[PDB]
Nucleic acid binder design. Structure first.
Lengths: 208, 214, 107, 214
RNA sequence: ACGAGAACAUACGUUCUUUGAACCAAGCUUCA
């Protein structure tokens, strides 16, 4: 049995994922439709970092293969014997609200100008940062496959923990300097094929 | 008498199947996708699609787990994908073909290449430095027109076999096809799923084409 | 050789164990797609009352093979062929109805 | 878990910050203020607040002048605002956010525009002809809420960390925040410096709320 | 009236499992 967890990532401040024309530091985008994109690798990595740091005694210093059983069963592993298949399955997230952004007569991304005033020179050496704008939304869905009936409650508690841990941190790029602040909303879980018995408890421990 | 199931595998996110470290001096890009050797198109092998469908179907007929050898699968899985035992050896009713990229003209219409490169980190929690890694992927929205040959040898099993085939396609709808799929890539979807007959019309083809096109 | 490509390739396949989630690769030489093989098959005509049914069976074998593979790991991708330019010419002995075989095989 | 620093920065002098020379329409405004792009209202960047904040702490700890790059500042600043060494990178703990305007309605009650333009004349050499020019500031008295996030990674350092955050804010009321501030712009003042946490009430909130309420 | 007739080197097998493009950086300097 498999479950799908669907929500929205709304950008409270600007965001800037990725890099590598005649301009400095572009964002990583969709390659066909040129939409700004959250890579699912970046969302999975930041969620894994925050959830592994909170599901621990404070801080997190070891390799991702050496995490707790909840983290390793939620995000996968690669060992010579203790290899596990991940239960979460993240996806690349394209920009959903181009209609909402295009209503306000603003581009989906914009260029941020900022200096580095050297102290002994007091001269600007300016640089351009492309940022997808604030108020942008990103509809995601993560596929959760159910293997243990007695562990789906703890797995979903950890998933909600990772969500509201990411609500108090940023998502990629120059984050401490203004960028990256996100927030999660419209969080729900649905079943892929054939209804789970305990779906209401998951919608109420994930809808809070 | 033999049936053909034709459809399209559309890439919802990027898809990274395959790779040979090519001898040509390509430069400072690593980890390419498997390509067609003559027409220079990225390719979905039939072996990869067959293996992922077989794993998801053998996993789905479950209650318990899936941990066995492929030859000790469920008998419906052995009659769909074949088995090679010493005595209980069954011919595979399915024949997969290598799928190459179809809508190259439409990717050229939007003036963009057929495969792209995604830059990807791994920050080590000791040192907090990033080591960038180039992973060549196929652009999402690319379409891969496949055809699988179904040879029918028992009328009393074909409806259950196509029920299981549609279930395997549905299990691929909520999983990924090849490569770094847990990190975003690999997500596919099946479109235009239809069945046609090779030669000589099957009489009850409508129930197969309506439980495959559901 | 116009495309600066070899006559043959190599194809990589893994095998994911379901118990232990680990892949062991293997390699297969394949002759690449877009390769063409000009063939000629010789038929000797013992009896004219059976030649049309024989050629009907030969074309049946050819398109039956066109919906199957030709050797090797054909269930897992490879092997798919397509016969083209199928034509019949008589070698020795003038055969009075040769165009009917040329159309039952060339259809 | 984490504890945030809610607050409100207000302007006692018309503040100038940011800039662009756009292709579409310059208009009768030279060097405009940086503004938020969707909500179209002005914005203190978190980058600007971090840069001026760090420059003032650099004026505070090693006093007077420094003539030094900001990757080799004092070690508390390397822990707080972040640093990138050769391979042994010492990470940040202090995350700023793009500060945008909150009190739109109480300026709309008095029919006052959110931003301010002034006609800054310039008298040249003894020929003595005015050289008029227009700069765009934001009106003094406008309020700006901020929510600085603070990861707790040392229990026995958050005392000194919040005391030097208050020392930096205390050094920032006696300074401008960016722009043409040297000739009468940019002067700020802090108010309503309330601290709340994400969950719980651990790593005691009372001492930090008192040392930011001082 | 060919050391020859008959005979698919064929069957089962995911190039797959790990990982944030991060960190360092007042659009500022002289303008009645």
């Amino acid at each position: 049995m498999k479950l799908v967890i669907e929500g929205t990532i709304v950008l409270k401040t600007g965001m800037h994922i990725g890099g590598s024309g005649a301009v400095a530091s572009p964002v990583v985008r969709d390659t066909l439709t040129r939409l700004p994109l959250i890579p699912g690798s970046s969302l999975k990595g930041k969620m894994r970092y925050l959830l592994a740091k909170e599901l621990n005694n404070g801080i997190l210093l070891n390799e991702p293969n050496n995490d707790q059983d909840e983290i390793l069963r939620l995000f996968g592993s690669s060992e010579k014997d203790k290899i596990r298949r991940a239960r979460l399955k993240f996806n690349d997230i394209k920009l959903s609200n181009l209609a909402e952004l295009e209503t306000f007569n603003v581009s989906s991304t914009e260029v941020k100008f900022e200096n580095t005033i050297n102290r002994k020179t007091a001269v600007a050496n300016p640089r351009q940062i492309e940022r997808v704008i604030a108020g942008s939304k990103f509809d995601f869905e993560i596929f959760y496959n159910l293997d243990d009936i007695k562990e789906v409650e703890k797995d979903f508690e950890n998933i909600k923990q990772g969500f509201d841990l990411l609500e108090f941190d940023y998502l990629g790029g120059h984050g401490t300097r203004g960028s990256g602040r996100i927030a999660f909303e419209n969080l729900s879980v649905i079943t892929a094929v054939g209804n789970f018995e305990k779906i209401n408890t998951l919608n109420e421990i994930l809808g809070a």
